[PDB]
Amino acid sequence: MTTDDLAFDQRHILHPYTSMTSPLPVYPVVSAEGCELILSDGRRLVDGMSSWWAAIHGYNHPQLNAAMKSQIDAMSHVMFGGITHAPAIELCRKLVAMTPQPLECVFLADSGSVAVEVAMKMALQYWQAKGEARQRFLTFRNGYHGDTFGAMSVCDPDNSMHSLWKGYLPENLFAPAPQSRMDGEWDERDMVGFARLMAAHRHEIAAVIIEPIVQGAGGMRMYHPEWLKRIRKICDREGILLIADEIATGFGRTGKLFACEHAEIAPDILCLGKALTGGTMTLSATLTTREVAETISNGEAGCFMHGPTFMGNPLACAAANASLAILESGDWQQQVADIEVQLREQLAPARDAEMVADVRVLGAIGVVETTHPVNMAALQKFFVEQGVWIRPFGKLIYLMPPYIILPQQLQRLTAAVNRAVQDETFFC
Amino acid sequence: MTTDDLAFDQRHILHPYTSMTSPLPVYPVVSAEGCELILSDGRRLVDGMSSWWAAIHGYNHPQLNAAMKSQIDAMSHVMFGGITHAPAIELCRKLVAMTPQPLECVFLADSGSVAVEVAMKMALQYWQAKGEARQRFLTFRNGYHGDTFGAMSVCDPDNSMHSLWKGYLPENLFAPAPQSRMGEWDERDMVGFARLMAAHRHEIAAVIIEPIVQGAGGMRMYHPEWLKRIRKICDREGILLIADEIATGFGRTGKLFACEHAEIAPDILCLGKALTGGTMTLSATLTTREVAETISNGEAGCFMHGPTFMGNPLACAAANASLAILESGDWQQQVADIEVQLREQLAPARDAEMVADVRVLGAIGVVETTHPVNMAALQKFFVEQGVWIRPFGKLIYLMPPYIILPQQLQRLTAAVNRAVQDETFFC
Ligand SMILES: Cc1ncc(COP(=O)(O)O)c(CNC2C=CC(CC[C@H](N)C(=O)O)C=C2)c1O
Ligand SMILES: NC1C=CC(CC[C@H](N)C(=O)O)C=C1
Ligand code: NA
Ligand code: NA
């Protein structure tokens, strides 16, 4: 990788949520292995991000590699219309067995935003089949569910700048962000806003959608499990469907296999992604109940009306199967728990830094919330120079390392976080 | 795959656009090679579908396989936020170079539906940045652009059953399906389109269409003059033109991009399917410097999109290998030869009672029938003839890999001709 490569990139390749006219530097990566990224210049970095939550087994995992390669020898891809195959059957068997019992129908898809679009269409069609007029969704502020239009319609109107689409996006219902903390106690006052919205609109709501326990892209917030317990019952009483978006939280990140387990509730529709494939390639899954799946098929349409070109991709299903096989060992329960204790201990000192507003930790997620926004170009350069890959965002400096990270590797991460927030050098 | 494996699939796995209650037979595929699918019981089938148009180089292609395994050795995936890599860079150089000049900025994403959503968002943000109140899209009837909410809002309201979402989908503008065939041009065809453009030109963010071929909405093949006329109309009104070539891209209609038939360049280009040689999902939406900068110079400060797996190294490497195969140029004659054989071998369907029309363009052969095909029965019959062909609605069509052999293509067409004789397989 030459500097002409980097110039081409800067001038012709869009990157996620980043200006094409006022660019910040990007770092060229050549390879990766275990918990390290390897830059083109040979510099090796400890990954604190898991490539956005997904690489829970790290990079170049032998089990993942061998499974992907074996699938390539049989067939990387074949269409899923009128056809089925072992990787898909194998993955759906595991998905069904590992999630709440009522969740037993699987619709595989390409991306997380699409899995959400799928969950929403399922809710709309479900009610359209029962002859009811339910077309609205009830969600929480600070929620994020994807960038496609449907998903955008249930994201925080602020964070996602809904003023850009005012008039195009449908107007859904936004209860206040849950206030009670996962580190703290329950407050019954938290529920007034949500309760108010439900009473006023209980009749037009097709479903409730939320991220269980951790609201990610919307502030890395961690709220009280009592919330899910409540929402599940309200939904049960009103006959409304519950959509849980575990695209970020699925597969052990929060300390439990699925974050819904923190409340011991099961949703009607469950969306998975990211760690599903061990972060090797995009794949998503939306699981639902027999009740939902059958109802839709008996309506006008005759079928749930969705079907992406690469649905069921054998290659990605094989990787996902290998990723779940690793998790079947159970070794993750202990890795995540130990990561939890080290993040609590080693980030605790940050609370005393001037620039810091809050330190919070759950499973393999450690968050340092600051008072002012980070200077991206500057803080990123600093992290790289310490030999770590940490990608902060706004006022959040956070870690979500692979579950196989070594204590020494984790310590490099937390020490770099602690040092970054010691002064205002890297702020504004 | 045991019988219990198949039982599980049927009861627990949702398949595309198909019922969970009256589910219809699926066939268990164990592997694939060349232009053939291989079932669990060893039966071999000539693929007439290219896995929904994507596998233009067939299956288990050594050049595609090697590029994939090699990229796996380096890293199948790494995030694209603040990071870049070679597969993405190399793929982007090819896309920019192979497309019309103005298209020089690439937004990679995961799937076709998403690529269309990206194109729509680019248009909305573009106009938001120029302070213009423009939120309508102008599209054609019989068009199909995907399954996500934004994409649905520009699909044919009848074919896509818009009544189901009536009230959720934004109301867009739908000009008449283009009548002139790919055939003689009739100026009267433009009346609909013009009537919508005049009354709404002040409102319209972009015109979106599939060039030359409207696939899923009916395999319709229209006259290139439309593209010429729409491009000029868009230039005049300062409206953006979005060309969805997710199905037409990479050689399918006889040219690299269907837009060439009219020698036109859109403002935004959507690509997918054949992009990776049908090995795994990936998409790209290309646009101009004007669009890309305007957006970044607006209030949001950047284009507001960024999926987790954006720029996936593995997919990018596969796509690089797919584009390299095309670089050899061989597809040019492969497709022309297929076109010839399809025209010749499907011509006899014009004597069959069940047939309404036979039309062909590049590696697309269509036998539109007089009545609703019975997909399950016909599917079984095709499997028994040793071929894979998936009908729908009133179309029995073929879109084979570019490398299909003459005797293999002969099977598909013979089966098609045999199928339509006979009332058996219909309604
Ligand atoms: C022109 C065009 N634009 C967008 C998309 C969406 O791409 P995805 O990758 O999101 O799907 C497509 C996809 N086209 C389709 C091709 C075939 C089928 C199936 C039709 C029929 N019901 C059958 O099963 O045989 C559906 C969509 C596209 O073409
Ligand atoms: N669901 C997600 C959406 C966006 C991201 C990226 C968020 C932030 N813009 C960042 O760059 O880290 C991560 C997850
Ligand atoms: Na289950
Ligand atoms: Na170009």
mmCIF file of all heavy atoms in Angstrom, chain A residues 16-17 49 52-53 144 146-147 217 274 376 391-393 398, chain B residues 79 81 306 308, ligand 2, unseen atoms left out:
data_model
loop_
_atom_site.group_PDB
_atom_site.id
_atom_site.type_symbol
_atom_site.label_atom_id
_atom_site.label_comp_id
_atom_site.label_asym_id
_atom_site.label_seq_id
_atom_site.Cartn_x
_atom_site.Cartn_y
_atom_site.Cartn_z
ATOM 1 N N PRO A 16 -17.795 5.517 6.295
ATOM 2 C CA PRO A 16 -18.990 5.692 7.144
ATOM 3 C C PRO A 16 -19.046 7.016 7.913
ATOM 4 O O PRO A 16 -18.102 7.343 8.626
ATOM 5 C CB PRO A 16 -18.927 4.508 8.138
ATOM 6 C CG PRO A 16 -17.861 3.596 7.665
ATOM 7 C CD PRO A 16 -17.009 4.332 6.675
ATOM 8 N N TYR A 17 -20.137 7.764 7.731
ATOM 9 C CA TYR A 17 -20.379 9.021 8.437
ATOM 10 C C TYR A 17 -19.139 9.930 8.481
ATOM 11 O O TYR A 17 -18.721 10.356 9.554
ATOM 12 C CB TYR A 17 -20.910 8.738 9.852
ATOM 13 C CG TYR A 17 -22.272 8.072 9.853
ATOM 14 C CD1 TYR A 17 -22.391 6.674 9.844
ATOM 15 C CD2 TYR A 17 -23.441 8.830 9.830
ATOM 16 C CE1 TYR A 17 -23.633 6.060 9.843
ATOM 17 C CE2 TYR A 17 -24.673 8.227 9.809
ATOM 18 C CZ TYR A 17 -24.762 6.841 9.818
ATOM 19 O OH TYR A 17 -25.991 6.248 9.796
ATOM 20 N N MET A 49 -11.855 -2.377 19.643
ATOM 21 C CA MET A 49 -13.174 -2.152 19.063
ATOM 22 C C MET A 49 -13.924 -3.395 18.584
ATOM 23 O O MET A 49 -15.144 -3.342 18.469
ATOM 24 C CB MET A 49 -13.026 -1.195 17.871
ATOM 25 C CG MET A 49 -12.438 0.157 18.222
ATOM 26 S SD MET A 49 -13.144 0.937 19.706
ATOM 27 C CE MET A 49 -14.804 1.168 19.130
ATOM 28 N N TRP A 52 -16.166 -2.801 15.479
ATOM 29 C CA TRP A 52 -17.551 -2.471 15.811
ATOM 30 C C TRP A 52 -18.343 -3.672 16.305
ATOM 31 O O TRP A 52 -19.302 -4.110 15.668
ATOM 32 C CB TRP A 52 -18.274 -1.773 14.651
ATOM 33 C CG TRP A 52 -17.981 -0.309 14.596
ATOM 34 C CD1 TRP A 52 -17.825 0.540 15.645
ATOM 35 C CD2 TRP A 52 -17.792 0.477 13.421
ATOM 36 N NE1 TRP A 52 -17.562 1.816 15.199
ATOM 37 C CE2 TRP A 52 -17.548 1.802 13.828
ATOM 38 C CE3 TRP A 52 -17.832 0.198 12.062
ATOM 39 C CZ2 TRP A 52 -17.312 2.827 12.926
ATOM 40 C CZ3 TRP A 52 -17.613 1.228 11.168
ATOM 41 C CH2 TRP A 52 -17.355 2.517 11.605
ATOM 42 N N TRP A 53 -17.896 -4.192 17.448
ATOM 43 C CA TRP A 53 -18.587 -5.177 18.257
ATOM 44 C C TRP A 53 -18.511 -6.619 17.710
ATOM 45 O O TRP A 53 -18.392 -7.559 18.512
ATOM 46 C CB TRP A 53 -20.045 -4.549 18.521
ATOM 47 C CG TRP A 53 -20.063 -2.915 18.393
ATOM 48 C CD1 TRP A 53 -19.160 -2.202 18.157
ATOM 49 C CD2 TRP A 53 -21.102 -1.964 18.399
ATOM 50 C CE2 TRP A 53 -20.504 -0.685 18.196
ATOM 51 C CE3 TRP A 53 -22.455 -2.027 18.564
ATOM 52 C CZ2 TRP A 53 -21.253 0.491 18.070
ATOM 53 C CZ3 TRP A 53 -23.207 -0.904 18.226
ATOM 54 C CH2 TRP A 53 -22.600 0.365 18.224
ATOM 55 N N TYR A 144 -30.998 3.446 18.295
ATOM 56 C CA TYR A 144 -30.453 3.415 16.931
ATOM 57 C C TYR A 144 -30.703 2.028 16.400
ATOM 58 O O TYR A 144 -30.350 1.056 17.064
ATOM 59 C CB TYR A 144 -28.946 3.715 16.875
ATOM 60 C CG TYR A 144 -28.412 3.555 15.468
ATOM 61 C CD1 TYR A 144 -28.634 4.541 14.515
ATOM 62 C CD2 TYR A 144 -27.711 2.411 15.069
ATOM 63 C CE1 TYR A 144 -28.187 4.405 13.232
ATOM 64 C CE2 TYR A 144 -27.243 2.280 13.762
ATOM 65 C CZ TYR A 144 -27.493 3.280 12.855
ATOM 66 O OH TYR A 144 -27.085 3.189 11.537
ATOM 67 N N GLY A 146 -30.373 1.290 12.660
ATOM 68 C CA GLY A 146 -29.937 1.158 11.270
ATOM 69 C C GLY A 146 -30.116 2.435 10.451
ATOM 70 O O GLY A 146 -30.724 3.394 10.934
ATOM 71 N N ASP A 147 -29.592 2.443 9.226
ATOM 72 C CA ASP A 147 -29.599 3.625 8.354
ATOM 73 C C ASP A 147 -30.573 3.538 7.199
ATOM 74 O O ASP A 147 -30.658 4.482 6.432
ATOM 75 C CB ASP A 147 -28.272 3.824 7.595
ATOM 76 C CG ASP A 147 -27.067 3.782 8.439
ATOM 77 O OD1 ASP A 147 -26.878 4.528 9.423
ATOM 78 O OD2 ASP A 147 -26.159 3.018 8.070
ATOM 79 N N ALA A 217 -25.314 3.079 19.473
ATOM 80 C CA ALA A 217 -24.982 4.230 18.641
ATOM 81 C C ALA A 217 -25.582 5.517 19.174
ATOM 82 O O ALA A 217 -25.186 6.609 18.790
ATOM 83 C CB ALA A 217 -25.431 3.980 17.230
ATOM 84 N N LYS A 274 -23.933 -8.683 13.513
ATOM 85 C CA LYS A 274 -22.595 -8.471 14.012
ATOM 86 C C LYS A 274 -21.850 -9.734 14.424
ATOM 87 O O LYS A 274 -21.299 -10.421 13.568
ATOM 88 C CB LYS A 274 -22.602 -7.394 15.094
ATOM 89 C CG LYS A 274 -22.958 -5.989 14.491
ATOM 90 C CD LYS A 274 -22.788 -4.811 15.450
ATOM 91 C CE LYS A 274 -22.883 -3.451 14.735
ATOM 92 N NZ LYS A 274 -24.015 -3.383 13.733
ATOM 93 N N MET A 376 -11.084 14.218 16.759
ATOM 94 C CA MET A 376 -10.888 12.933 16.122
ATOM 95 C C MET A 376 -9.506 12.713 15.569
ATOM 96 O O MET A 376 -8.863 11.723 15.912
ATOM 97 C CB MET A 376 -11.930 12.742 15.038
ATOM 98 C CG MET A 376 -13.262 12.369 15.633
ATOM 99 S SD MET A 376 -13.209 10.773 16.445
ATOM 100 C CE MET A 376 -13.634 9.670 14.939
ATOM 101 N N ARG A 391 -11.515 3.731 18.639
ATOM 102 C CA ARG A 391 -12.179 4.698 17.767
ATOM 103 C C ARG A 391 -13.262 5.397 18.557
ATOM 104 O O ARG A 391 -14.384 4.936 18.634
ATOM 105 C CB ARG A 391 -12.853 4.043 16.552
ATOM 106 C CG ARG A 391 -13.282 5.035 15.419
ATOM 107 C CD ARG A 391 -14.758 4.809 14.954
ATOM 108 N NE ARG A 391 -15.317 5.546 13.804
ATOM 109 C CZ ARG A 391 -14.704 6.379 12.983
ATOM 110 N NH1 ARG A 391 -13.422 6.696 13.097
ATOM 111 N NH2 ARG A 391 -15.418 6.921 12.017
ATOM 112 N N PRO A 392 -12.954 6.545 19.096
ATOM 113 C CA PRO A 392 -13.905 7.242 19.945
ATOM 114 C C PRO A 392 -14.969 7.891 19.083
ATOM 115 O O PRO A 392 -14.812 7.982 17.869
ATOM 116 C CB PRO A 392 -13.036 8.287 20.636
ATOM 117 C CG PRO A 392 -11.965 8.585 19.638
ATOM 118 C CD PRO A 392 -11.729 7.317 18.872
ATOM 119 N N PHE A 393 -16.054 8.334 19.711
ATOM 120 C CA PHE A 393 -17.121 8.950 18.948
ATOM 121 C C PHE A 393 -17.856 9.979 19.829
ATOM 122 O O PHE A 393 -18.415 9.621 20.864
ATOM 123 C CB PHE A 393 -18.008 7.766 18.507
ATOM 124 C CG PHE A 393 -19.393 8.142 18.120
ATOM 125 C CD1 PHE A 393 -19.622 9.146 17.201
ATOM 126 C CD2 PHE A 393 -20.467 7.462 18.662
ATOM 127 C CE1 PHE A 393 -20.919 9.483 16.827
ATOM 128 C CE2 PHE A 393 -21.744 7.781 18.303
ATOM 129 C CZ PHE A 393 -21.982 8.804 17.384
ATOM 130 N N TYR A 398 -14.784 4.441 24.246
ATOM 131 C CA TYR A 398 -15.204 3.127 24.729
ATOM 132 C C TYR A 398 -14.375 1.931 24.196
ATOM 133 O O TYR A 398 -13.657 2.043 23.218
ATOM 134 C CB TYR A 398 -16.688 2.913 24.423
ATOM 135 C CG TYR A 398 -17.022 2.850 22.955
ATOM 136 C CD1 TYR A 398 -17.295 1.639 22.339
ATOM 137 C CD2 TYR A 398 -17.103 3.994 22.189
ATOM 138 C CE1 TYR A 398 -17.604 1.576 20.995
ATOM 139 C CE2 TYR A 398 -17.409 3.940 20.840
ATOM 140 C CZ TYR A 398 -17.664 2.726 20.255
ATOM 141 O OH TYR A 398 -17.979 2.674 18.931
ATOM 142 N N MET B 79 -13.107 -3.175 10.209
ATOM 143 C CA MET B 79 -13.984 -2.001 10.098
ATOM 144 C C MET B 79 -13.391 -0.952 9.152
ATOM 145 O O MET B 79 -12.154 -0.907 8.916
ATOM 146 C CB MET B 79 -14.244 -1.380 11.468
ATOM 147 C CG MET B 79 -12.999 -0.827 12.205
ATOM 148 S SD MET B 79 -13.337 -0.223 13.892
ATOM 149 C CE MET B 79 -14.206 1.268 13.522
ATOM 150 N N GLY B 81 -14.371 2.427 9.458
ATOM 151 C CA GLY B 81 -14.331 3.731 10.112
ATOM 152 C C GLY B 81 -12.885 4.086 10.470
ATOM 153 O O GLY B 81 -12.296 3.415 11.322
ATOM 154 N N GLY B 306 -23.505 4.527 6.856
ATOM 155 C CA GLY B 306 -22.317 3.809 7.289
ATOM 156 C C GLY B 306 -22.629 2.483 7.959
ATOM 157 O O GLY B 306 -22.605 2.373 9.161
ATOM 158 N N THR B 308 -22.251 -1.431 9.338
ATOM 159 C CA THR B 308 -21.162 -2.072 10.055
ATOM 160 C C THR B 308 -20.105 -2.709 9.177
ATOM 161 O O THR B 308 -18.926 -2.566 9.431
ATOM 162 C CB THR B 308 -21.697 -3.206 10.955
ATOM 163 O OG1 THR B 308 -22.576 -2.678 11.931
ATOM 164 C CG2 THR B 308 -20.568 -3.817 11.802
HETATM 165 N N1 LIG C 2 -25.030 0.728 14.821
HETATM 166 C C1 LIG C 2 -23.941 1.492 14.626
HETATM 167 C C2 LIG C 2 -24.026 2.614 13.821
HETATM 168 C C3 LIG C 2 -22.907 3.393 13.619
HETATM 169 C C4 LIG C 2 -21.686 3.022 14.170
HETATM 170 C C5 LIG C 2 -20.667 4.066 14.098
HETATM 171 C C6 LIG C 2 -20.952 5.114 15.197
HETATM 172 C C7 LIG C 2 -19.988 6.311 15.235
HETATM 173 N N2 LIG C 2 -20.404 7.116 14.100
HETATM 174 C C8 LIG C 2 -18.549 5.917 15.118
HETATM 175 O O1 LIG C 2 -17.890 6.266 14.158
HETATM 176 O O2 LIG C 2 -18.021 5.260 15.981
HETATM 177 C C9 LIG C 2 -21.595 1.920 15.029
HETATM 178 C C10 LIG C 2 -22.736 1.134 15.227
#
